[PDB]
Amino acid sequence: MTLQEQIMKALHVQPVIDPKAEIRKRVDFLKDYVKKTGAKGFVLGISGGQDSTLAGRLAQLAVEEIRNEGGNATFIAVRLPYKVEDDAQLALQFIQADQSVAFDIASTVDAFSNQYENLLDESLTDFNKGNVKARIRMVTQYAIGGQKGLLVIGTDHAAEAVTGFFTKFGDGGADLLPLTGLTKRQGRALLQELGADERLYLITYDQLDDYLEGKTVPADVAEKIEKRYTVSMFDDWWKLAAALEHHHHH
């Protein structure tokens, strides 16, 4: 297999998808995991980002279907601002979750930061604080999940990230990853099919997504992408490398 074919197989990306069928398959994936684990539903942090907007809508459709089939399921969407968006609100209006919680993480993040800066006698850098915030957001989702018997839906470990590009803050841990196999642009296709407000979804992502979707791309573009894939979960390696690099050049 060409390296491109190996990558696609490893990331489960398909060259051509059927949006309606993708939504069907992923809503089923969610419904099946609920049944297998005995969970009462899902919880997800809604940031206004494309991934959580799509994953959130899929979760709402899933619990509605479960209830329609005579089962018990609930979806709790949680907004996790640090002090202070309209994108998040717009996403919540699209998702229409059973419960929408506004949980400011500032008092927790600041208590940690204040303790850290006092005990270690140094200031937390923007990058490391970025990871603290991401982790505190996960603490919040897992606390809600644990208190309500829900599964935490994750949006990290996206195809592009595993490849080595566009890495996110945080460790990416979650109970389920319903968007596995989709590129950023394919996700855009699902959101369109779901009727989301276009504003919710409107090397580069296009070049990278062309490559991941098995399309033909310039030799140099392929070289750059395969170069990073070979240097390398692959995603975790890039998260650690980023932390080390920022510390080094700080």
Place this chain on the structure above:
Amino acid sequence: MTLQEQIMKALHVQPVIDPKAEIRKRVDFLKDYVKKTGAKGFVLGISGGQDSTLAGRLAQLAVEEIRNEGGNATFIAVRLPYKEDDAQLALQFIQADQSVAFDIASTVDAFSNQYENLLDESLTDFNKGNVKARIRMVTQYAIGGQKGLLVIGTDHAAEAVTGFFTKFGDGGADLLPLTGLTKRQGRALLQELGADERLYLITYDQLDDYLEGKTVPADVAEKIEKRYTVSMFDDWWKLAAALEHHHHH
């Protein structure tokens, strides 16, 4: 190959080990990871528990060797109390370059107070247990990120991956130096390292007998193999624990 032999292989547990050889093997593992990642050392939460006590000493030995060989490495041990006799004894045995006392109470209570107010309910003991474990990991990763260090983990022990003696938290870490060792073998390494007896002294004996390739009663093997099949394996049990506690609450 029996199921028992398959499980031993999958978990990398050896029927017989040589404490000195294991120590050298695991110290080399730590040193090699440092070189491959370009990190400046390690950070580890010291609880007073056997796993972190052993992993911490191996970390200190690793950085001393790296420095002795002309390299740069540092080991930072951190005590994370929530509002530590065994932890103090452990720190004394480990003799780390830096020992930090970081009380997590102000962070855990800030979260708890916010949670109870916004969701209008009390955090159960089990769920607060996970909150504390995660906050302890936030601290270690914040220290690691700020110092260019790797976070050493002690979760995903052989016994846990099999489905027994599950721990709080998600078990995420940068490196797992104790992979393959049973709790019993861990004690052996500690004695070889000269640790204070107070630091290392289905049941663990039945389970470790099985994982070590010893012949055990059919019913014992039956129970162990049953859980191993009902499933990361460890993560499944963490989730199951959270769901069961919520249910029986």
